[PDB]
Amino acid sequence: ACPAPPPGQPDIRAIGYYTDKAGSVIDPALQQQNKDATAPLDRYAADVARMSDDYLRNGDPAAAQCTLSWLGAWADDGAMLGQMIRVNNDQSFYMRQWMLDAVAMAYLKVHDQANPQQRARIDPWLQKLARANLAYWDNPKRRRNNHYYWGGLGVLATGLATDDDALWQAGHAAFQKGIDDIQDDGSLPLEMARGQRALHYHDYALAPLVMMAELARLRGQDWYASRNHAIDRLARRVIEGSRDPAWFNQHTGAAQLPLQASGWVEFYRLRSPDGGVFDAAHARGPFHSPRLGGDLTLMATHGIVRTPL
Protein backbone atom coordinates (compact mmCIF):
# COMPACT_ATOMS: atom_id res chain seq x y z
CA ALA A 1 0.00 0.00 0.00
CA CYS A 2 3.02 2.31 0.80
CA PRO A 3 5.58 1.74 -2.00
CA ALA A 4 9.33 1.22 -1.20
CA PRO A 5 11.37 4.45 -0.90
CA PRO A 6 14.53 4.75 -3.07
CA PRO A 7 17.79 4.11 -1.09
CA GLY A 8 19.07 7.34 0.59
CA GLN A 9 22.48 8.50 -0.77
CA PRO A 10 24.78 10.37 1.71
CA ASP A 11 26.75 12.12 -1.13
CA ILE A 12 25.37 14.70 -3.63
CA ARG A 13 27.24 15.32 -6.95
CA ALA A 14 25.45 18.12 -8.86
CA ILE A 15 26.92 20.16 -11.81
CA GLY A 16 26.73 23.94 -12.51
CA TYR A 17 25.36 24.55 -16.06
CA TYR A 18 25.97 28.34 -16.54
CA THR A 19 28.60 29.52 -19.09
CA ASP A 20 28.88 33.23 -18.19
CA LYS A 21 29.93 35.43 -15.24
CA ALA A 22 26.27 36.72 -15.09
CA GLY A 23 25.00 33.08 -14.53
CA SER A 24 22.49 33.72 -17.40
CA VAL A 25 23.62 31.53 -20.42
CA ILE A 26 22.88 27.75 -20.17
CA ASP A 27 25.12 25.00 -21.63
CA PRO A 28 22.40 22.44 -22.62
CA ALA A 29 24.94 19.53 -22.22
CA LEU A 30 25.89 20.47 -18.57
CA GLN A 31 22.17 21.10 -17.75
CA GLN A 32 21.12 17.54 -18.84
CA GLN A 33 24.16 16.06 -17.01
CA ASN A 34 23.01 17.87 -13.81
CA LYS A 35 19.37 16.77 -14.47
CA ASP A 36 20.59 13.07 -14.70
CA ALA A 37 22.81 13.23 -11.52
CA THR A 38 19.98 14.93 -9.47
CA ALA A 39 17.07 12.87 -11.02
CA PRO A 40 16.86 10.39 -8.04
CA LEU A 41 16.92 13.35 -5.56
CA ASP A 42 14.21 15.34 -7.48
CA ARG A 43 12.07 12.13 -7.80
CA TYR A 44 12.09 11.78 -3.96
CA ALA A 45 11.22 15.53 -3.57
CA ALA A 46 8.24 15.29 -6.03
CA ASP A 47 7.04 12.06 -4.25
CA VAL A 48 7.10 13.34 -0.59
CA ALA A 49 5.61 16.66 -1.84
CA ARG A 50 2.80 14.71 -3.63
CA MET A 51 1.87 12.25 -0.81
CA SER A 52 1.95 15.29 1.59
CA ASP A 53 -0.28 17.17 -0.92
CA ASP A 54 -2.61 14.08 -0.87
CA TYR A 55 -2.88 14.30 2.95
CA LEU A 56 -3.83 18.05 2.84
CA ARG A 57 -6.39 17.34 -0.03
CA ASN A 58 -8.53 14.53 1.57
CA GLY A 59 -7.01 13.99 5.12
CA ASP A 60 -6.46 10.21 4.54
CA PRO A 61 -3.88 9.35 7.27
CA ALA A 62 -2.51 6.55 4.97
CA ALA A 63 -0.92 9.25 2.69
CA ALA A 64 0.65 10.97 5.79
CA GLN A 65 2.10 7.66 7.18
CA CYS A 66 3.59 6.69 3.77
CA THR A 67 5.19 10.23 3.68
CA LEU A 68 6.48 9.74 7.29
CA SER A 69 7.78 6.22 6.33
CA TRP A 70 9.67 7.64 3.26
CA LEU A 71 11.15 10.42 5.47
CA GLY A 72 12.02 7.79 8.15
CA ALA A 73 13.90 5.62 5.58
CA TRP A 74 16.09 8.52 4.30
CA ALA A 75 16.82 9.52 7.98
CA ASP A 76 17.91 5.92 8.99
CA ASP A 77 19.93 5.87 5.70
CA GLY A 78 21.66 9.19 6.63
CA ALA A 79 20.54 10.64 3.23
CA MET A 80 22.51 13.79 2.11
CA LEU A 81 24.63 13.92 5.38
CA GLY A 82 27.78 12.94 3.38
CA GLN A 83 30.13 14.88 1.02
CA MET A 84 28.84 17.76 -1.19
CA ILE A 85 31.06 16.93 -4.23
CA ARG A 86 32.37 20.05 -6.11
CA VAL A 87 32.46 19.52 -9.95
CA ASN A 88 32.54 23.14 -11.33
CA ASN A 89 30.69 25.05 -8.49
CA ASP A 90 28.74 24.73 -5.15
CA GLN A 91 25.66 23.15 -6.99
CA SER A 92 25.79 20.15 -4.53
CA PHE A 93 25.32 22.60 -1.51
CA TYR A 94 22.44 24.37 -3.45
CA MET A 95 20.84 20.92 -4.12
CA ARG A 96 21.08 20.09 -0.34
CA GLN A 97 19.21 23.38 0.50
CA TRP A 98 16.50 22.66 -2.13
CA MET A 99 16.20 19.04 -0.88
CA LEU A 100 15.90 20.15 2.82
CA ASP A 101 13.23 22.71 1.66
CA ALA A 102 11.18 19.86 0.03
CA VAL A 103 11.48 17.12 2.75
CA ALA A 104 11.14 19.64 5.70
CA MET A 105 7.93 21.24 4.23
CA ALA A 106 6.66 17.67 3.43
CA TYR A 107 7.32 16.69 7.10
CA LEU A 108 5.60 19.87 8.38
CA LYS A 109 2.40 19.05 6.40
CA VAL A 110 2.07 15.50 7.92
CA HIS A 111 3.65 16.35 11.32
CA ASP A 112 0.26 16.12 13.17
CA GLN A 113 0.21 12.37 12.17
CA ALA A 114 3.84 11.56 13.31
CA ASN A 115 4.02 9.07 16.24
CA PRO A 116 6.71 9.51 18.95
CA GLN A 117 9.18 7.03 17.25
CA GLN A 118 8.85 8.65 13.76
CA ARG A 119 9.70 12.09 15.33
CA ALA A 120 12.88 10.60 16.98
CA ARG A 121 14.25 9.45 13.53
CA ILE A 122 13.23 12.40 11.22
CA ASP A 123 13.86 15.36 13.66
CA PRO A 124 17.67 14.86 14.18
CA TRP A 125 18.17 14.03 10.45
CA LEU A 126 16.40 17.33 9.44
CA GLN A 127 18.38 19.20 12.20
CA LYS A 128 21.79 17.76 11.07
CA LEU A 129 20.83 18.91 7.49
CA ALA A 130 19.68 22.41 8.66
CA ARG A 131 22.89 23.04 10.73
CA ALA A 132 25.12 21.91 7.77
CA ASN A 133 23.20 24.38 5.47
CA LEU A 134 23.63 27.12 8.19
CA ALA A 135 27.43 26.55 8.72
CA TYR A 136 27.91 27.04 4.92
CA TRP A 137 26.67 30.70 5.30
CA ASP A 138 28.91 31.45 8.35
CA ASN A 139 31.76 32.08 5.80
CA PRO A 140 31.54 35.78 4.78
CA LYS A 141 32.96 35.01 1.26
CA ARG A 142 29.67 33.25 0.27
CA ARG A 143 27.44 35.73 -1.67
CA ARG A 144 24.13 35.75 0.35
CA ASN A 145 21.80 36.09 -2.69
CA ASN A 146 18.63 34.05 -3.56
CA HIS A 147 20.66 30.90 -2.48
CA TYR A 148 20.61 32.29 1.14
CA TYR A 149 16.79 32.81 1.01
CA TRP A 150 16.25 29.27 -0.49
CA GLY A 151 18.62 27.81 2.15
CA GLY A 152 16.77 29.90 4.76
CA LEU A 153 13.36 28.27 3.94
CA GLY A 154 14.43 24.64 4.68
CA VAL A 155 16.05 25.73 8.00
CA LEU A 156 12.84 27.63 9.01
CA ALA A 157 10.46 24.70 8.23
CA THR A 158 12.89 22.44 10.21
CA GLY A 159 12.96 24.82 13.26
CA LEU A 160 9.08 24.92 13.21
CA ALA A 161 8.38 21.18 12.58
CA THR A 162 11.10 19.87 15.01
CA ASP A 163 10.46 22.71 17.59
CA ASP A 164 14.06 24.15 17.58
CA ASP A 165 14.35 27.89 18.47
CA ALA A 166 17.93 28.46 17.14
CA LEU A 167 16.93 27.08 13.67
CA TRP A 168 13.76 29.33 13.71
CA GLN A 169 15.79 32.53 14.55
CA ALA A 170 18.37 31.53 11.82
CA GLY A 171 15.49 31.06 9.31
CA HIS A 172 14.23 34.54 10.33
CA ALA A 173 17.76 35.98 9.75
CA ALA A 174 17.70 34.63 6.12
CA PHE A 175 14.19 36.17 5.41
CA GLN A 176 15.32 39.48 7.02
CA LYS A 177 18.42 39.64 4.70
CA GLY A 178 16.25 39.27 1.55
CA ILE A 179 13.80 42.01 2.78
CA ASP A 180 16.75 44.27 3.83
CA ASP A 181 18.33 43.94 0.30
CA ILE A 182 15.10 45.18 -1.47
CA GLN A 183 15.76 48.70 -2.86
CA ASP A 184 13.00 51.43 -3.08
CA ASP A 185 12.43 50.18 -6.72
CA GLY A 186 11.68 46.56 -5.54
CA SER A 187 15.04 45.33 -6.88
CA LEU A 188 17.68 42.99 -5.33
CA PRO A 189 21.16 44.31 -6.28
CA LEU A 190 22.78 40.78 -6.46
CA GLU A 191 19.85 39.60 -8.73
CA MET A 192 20.30 42.68 -11.06
CA ALA A 193 23.66 41.17 -12.33
CA ARG A 194 21.89 38.09 -13.85
CA GLY A 195 21.50 39.71 -17.32
CA GLN A 196 18.69 38.06 -19.37
CA ARG A 197 17.57 36.07 -16.21
CA ALA A 198 17.42 39.15 -13.87
CA LEU A 199 13.56 39.07 -13.84
CA HIS A 200 13.58 35.21 -13.37
CA TYR A 201 15.92 35.56 -10.32
CA HIS A 202 13.62 38.24 -8.70
CA ASP A 203 10.63 35.79 -8.85
CA TYR A 204 13.00 32.98 -7.79
CA ALA A 205 14.28 35.15 -4.85
CA LEU A 206 10.74 36.28 -3.81
CA ALA A 207 9.20 32.72 -3.62
CA PRO A 208 11.15 31.32 -0.60
CA LEU A 209 10.75 34.78 1.07
CA VAL A 210 6.87 34.63 0.78
CA MET A 211 6.96 30.94 1.94
CA MET A 212 9.10 31.79 5.04
CA ALA A 213 6.63 34.69 5.82
CA GLU A 214 3.77 32.09 5.54
CA LEU A 215 5.53 29.73 8.04
CA ALA A 216 5.77 32.76 10.44
CA ARG A 217 1.95 33.26 10.02
CA LEU A 218 1.54 29.64 11.28
CA ARG A 219 3.46 30.52 14.54
CA GLY A 220 1.33 33.75 14.88
CA GLN A 221 3.92 36.38 13.69
CA ASP A 222 3.56 38.83 10.70
CA TRP A 223 6.89 39.13 8.79
CA TYR A 224 5.21 40.81 5.73
CA ALA A 225 5.30 44.24 7.53
CA SER A 226 9.16 44.14 7.87
CA ARG A 227 10.79 47.44 6.65
CA ASN A 228 7.40 49.07 5.76
CA HIS A 229 6.04 46.15 3.59
CA ALA A 230 9.34 46.22 1.58
CA ILE A 231 8.47 42.75 0.10
CA ASP A 232 5.43 44.42 -1.61
CA ARG A 233 7.93 46.42 -3.76
CA LEU A 234 9.66 43.15 -4.88
CA ALA A 235 6.26 41.46 -5.56
CA ARG A 236 5.05 44.46 -7.67
CA ARG A 237 8.46 44.67 -9.46
CA VAL A 238 8.25 40.94 -10.50
CA ILE A 239 4.50 41.01 -11.52
CA GLU A 240 4.98 44.36 -13.45
CA GLY A 241 7.96 42.38 -14.97
CA SER A 242 5.59 39.49 -16.04
CA ARG A 243 3.60 41.86 -18.32
CA ASP A 244 6.31 44.37 -19.47
CA PRO A 245 10.07 43.57 -19.34
CA ALA A 246 10.84 47.24 -20.33
CA TRP A 247 12.26 48.20 -16.88
CA PHE A 248 14.56 45.08 -16.60
CA ASN A 249 15.51 45.44 -20.32
CA GLN A 250 16.73 49.03 -19.59
CA HIS A 251 18.39 48.52 -16.12
CA THR A 252 20.44 45.42 -17.21
CA GLY A 253 20.76 46.29 -20.95
CA ALA A 254 19.87 42.61 -21.68
CA ALA A 255 16.53 41.38 -23.16
CA GLN A 256 14.71 39.41 -20.40
CA LEU A 257 13.70 35.77 -21.01
CA PRO A 258 9.89 36.07 -20.61
CA LEU A 259 8.66 35.17 -17.05
CA GLN A 260 5.40 33.67 -15.73
CA ALA A 261 5.23 34.36 -11.93
CA SER A 262 5.70 31.30 -9.62
CA GLY A 263 3.21 30.03 -6.97
CA TRP A 264 4.15 32.66 -4.33
CA VAL A 265 1.28 34.67 -5.96
CA GLU A 266 -1.20 32.01 -4.57
CA PHE A 267 -0.35 33.14 -0.97
CA TYR A 268 0.61 36.81 -1.61
CA ARG A 269 -2.66 37.73 -3.52
CA LEU A 270 -4.51 36.85 -0.20
CA ARG A 271 -2.20 39.09 1.95
CA SER A 272 -1.81 42.21 -0.32
CA PRO A 273 -4.17 41.88 -3.37
CA ASP A 274 -2.78 45.28 -4.56
CA GLY A 275 -5.22 45.92 -7.49
CA GLY A 276 -5.83 42.24 -8.42
CA VAL A 277 -2.32 42.47 -10.06
CA PHE A 278 -1.53 38.75 -9.24
CA ASP A 279 -4.99 37.45 -10.45
CA ALA A 280 -3.73 36.79 -14.06
CA ALA A 281 -0.86 34.73 -12.50
CA HIS A 282 -3.46 33.06 -10.13
CA ALA A 283 -5.62 32.08 -13.22
CA ARG A 284 -2.68 30.05 -14.67
CA GLY A 285 -3.79 26.68 -13.13
CA PRO A 286 -2.74 25.09 -9.79
CA PHE A 287 0.98 25.65 -8.75
CA HIS A 288 3.12 22.55 -7.97
CA SER A 289 6.64 23.24 -6.58
CA PRO A 290 8.16 20.46 -4.36
CA ARG A 291 11.04 22.78 -3.22
CA LEU A 292 8.45 25.41 -2.04
CA GLY A 293 6.33 22.64 -0.35
CA GLY A 294 4.24 21.08 -3.19
CA ASP A 295 0.70 22.20 -4.20
CA LEU A 296 1.00 25.95 -3.41
CA THR A 297 -2.68 26.41 -4.52
CA LEU A 298 -3.97 23.79 -2.01
CA MET A 299 -1.77 25.20 0.81
CA ALA A 300 -2.71 28.90 0.22
CA THR A 301 -6.51 28.14 0.16
CA HIS A 302 -6.86 25.45 2.94
CA GLY A 303 -3.54 25.82 4.94
CA ILE A 304 0.09 24.55 4.94
CA VAL A 305 -1.16 22.20 7.78
CA ARG A 306 -4.68 20.79 8.52
CA THR A 307 -4.55 21.21 12.35
CA PRO A 308 -2.83 24.35 13.78
CA LEU A 309 0.32 23.32 15.79
From Swiss-Prot:
<dbReference type="GO" id="GO:0009279">
    <property type="term" value="C:cell outer membrane"/>
</dbReference>
<comment type="function">
    <text>Polysaccharide lyase that catalyzes the depolymerization of several anionic polysaccharides via a beta-elimination mechanism. Exhibits broad substrate specificity, catalyzing the degradation of not only alginate and poly-beta-D-mannuronate (poly-ManA), but poly-beta-D-glucuronate (poly-GlcA or poly-GlcUA) and hyaluronate (HA) as well. The oligosaccharide products formed by enzymatic cleavage are comprised mainly of disaccharides, with a lower abundance of trimers and pentamers. Is not active on poly-D-galacturonate, heparin and heparin sulfate.</text>
</comment>
<dbReference type="GO" id="GO:0000272">
    <property type="term" value="P:polysaccharide catabolic process"/>
</dbReference>
<keyword id="KW-0998">Cell outer membrane</keyword>
<keyword id="KW-0624">Polysaccharide degradation</keyword>
<dbReference type="GO" id="GO:0030340">
    <property type="term" value="F:hyaluronate lyase activity"/>
</dbReference>
<dbReference type="GO" id="GO:0042597">
    <property type="term" value="C:periplasmic space"/>
</dbReference>
<protein>
    <recommendedName>
        <fullName>Polysaccharide lyase</fullName>
        <ecNumber>4.2.2.-</ecNumber>
        <ecNumber>4.2.2.3</ecNumber>
        <ecNumber>4.2.2.1</ecNumber>
        <ecNumber>4.2.2.14</ecNumber>
    </recommendedName>
</protein>
<keyword id="KW-0564">Palmitate</keyword>
<keyword id="KW-0472">Membrane</keyword>
<feature type="lipid moiety-binding region" description="S-diacylglycerol cysteine">
    <location>
        <position position="2"/>
    </location>
</feature>
<keyword id="KW-0456">Lyase</keyword>
<dbReference type="GO" id="GO:0045135">
    <property type="term" value="F:poly(beta-D-mannuronate) lyase activity"/>
</dbReference>
<dbReference type="InterPro" id="IPR008929">
    <property type="entry name" value="Chondroitin_lyas"/>
</dbReference>
<dbReference type="InterPro" id="IPR008397">
    <property type="entry name" value="Alginate_lyase_dom"/>
</dbReference>
<keyword id="KW-0732">Signal</keyword>
<feature type="lipid moiety-binding region" description="N-palmitoyl cysteine">
    <location>
        <position position="2"/>
    </location>
</feature>
<keyword id="KW-0449">Lipoprotein</keyword>
<keyword id="KW-0119">Carbohydrate metabolism</keyword>
<comment type="similarity">
    <text>Belongs to the polysaccharide lyase 5 family.</text>
</comment>
<dbReference type="Pfam" id="PF05426">
    <property type="entry name" value="Alginate_lyase"/>
</dbReference>
<dbReference type="GO" id="GO:0033994">
    <property type="term" value="F:glucuronan lyase activity"/>
</dbReference>
